[PDB]
């Protein structure tokens, strides 16, 4: 996260890390058996690491569970990143405690202005790279689809929201993909793509989760 803070213990319990050797993306726990991430984070073989904080040392409070099902949104487009959302069903339910917990799907969409908390173990340098052991957090508002489109033209579809600052300096970055953008206690975004990190006039584009709630419902109940 470029320019955010160390999150503090048991602050972000739905944060999930996707591992296949090492952290390559993050995700959110949405119920004891299903994690939501981004479709471009797909691998066959993903190990979900739950209750993580320092991902570099084992602190005995973590749960590592293999993914049994990895399902990318059917209409996901690898070139335009539209419908960038993926559901992972865990081969065993995570035991929910303080360190491990569920985010809620949206009662509705966020309105331009709402502040949110973005979180991840991704890079912390817009120019260069440092990869933090500890989970980084960032407060940022949802931008207007109008700002979002003017910032990235011909690219922002109606399933993508920009969250961040037009003046740069604070943003999600590589390693954060798939992570949560939680606003008012509801998961409104998934970190997806962007032009570089924390650049001026380039805010993060996140998958608009309010558009997919019934798909999520439908897949969880049908699998």
Give the whole-angstrom CA distance, residue 192 versus residue 184: 20
Q: Which residue among the candidates 119, 126, 172, 177 is catalytic per the annotation? A: 177
Give the whole-angstrom CA distance, residue 123 versus residue 64: 23
Q: Which residues fall in the annotated binding site for Ca(2+)? A: 52, 54, 57, 62
**40 annotated active-site:** yes
Q: Does 155 bind a second copy (CB under 8 A)?
A: yes
Give the whole-angstrom CA distance, residue 73 versus residue 128: 32
Residues numbered 155 to 194 that lie near other proteins (CB under 8 A) are 155, 172-178, 191-194
**28 annotated active-site:** no
Give the whole-angstrom CA distance, residue 102 versus residue 188: 14
Residues 6+ apart with CB under 8 A from 136: 1, 4, 5, 6, 7, 119, 120, 121, 122, 124
Residues numbered 53 to 92 that lie near other proteins (CB under 8 A) are 78-79, 81, 84
Applying CB under 8 A, the residues found at the interface with a second copy are 77-80, 154-155
Applying CB under 8 A, the residues found at the interface with other proteins are 22-25, 38, 40-41, 78-79, 81, 84, 122, 155, 172-178, 191-197, 204
Residues taking part in catalysis = 40, 84, 177
């Amino acid at each position: 996260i470029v320019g955010g803070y160390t999150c503090a213990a048991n602050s972000v319990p739905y944060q999930v890390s996707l591992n296949s050797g090492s952290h390559f993306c993050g995700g959110s726990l949405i119920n004891s058996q299903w994690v939501v991430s981004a479709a471009h984070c797909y691998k066959s073989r993903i190990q979900v690491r739950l209750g993580e904080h320092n991902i570099d040392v084992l602190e005995g409070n973590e749960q590592f569970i293999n993914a049994a099902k990895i399902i990318t949104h059917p209409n996901f487009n690898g070139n335009t990143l539209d419908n960038d959302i993926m559901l992972i069903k865990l081969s065993s339910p995570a035991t929910l405690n303080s360190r491990v917990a569920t985010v809620s799907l949206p009662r509705s969409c966020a309105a331009a202005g709402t502040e949110c908390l973005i979180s991840g173990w991704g890079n912390t340098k817009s120019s260069g790279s440092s990869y933090p052991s500890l989970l980084q957090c960032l407060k940022a508002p949802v931008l207007s689809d109008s700002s979002c489109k003017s910032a990235y033209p011909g690219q922002i579809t109606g399933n993508m929201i920009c969250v961040g600052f037009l003046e740069g300096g604070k943003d999600s970055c590589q390693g954060d993909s798939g992570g949560p953008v939680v606003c008012n206690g509801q998961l409104q975004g998934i970190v997806s793509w962007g032009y570089g990190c924390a650049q001026k006039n380039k805010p993060g584009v996140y998958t608009k989760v309010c558009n997919y709630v019934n798909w999520i419902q439908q897949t969880i109940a049908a699998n």
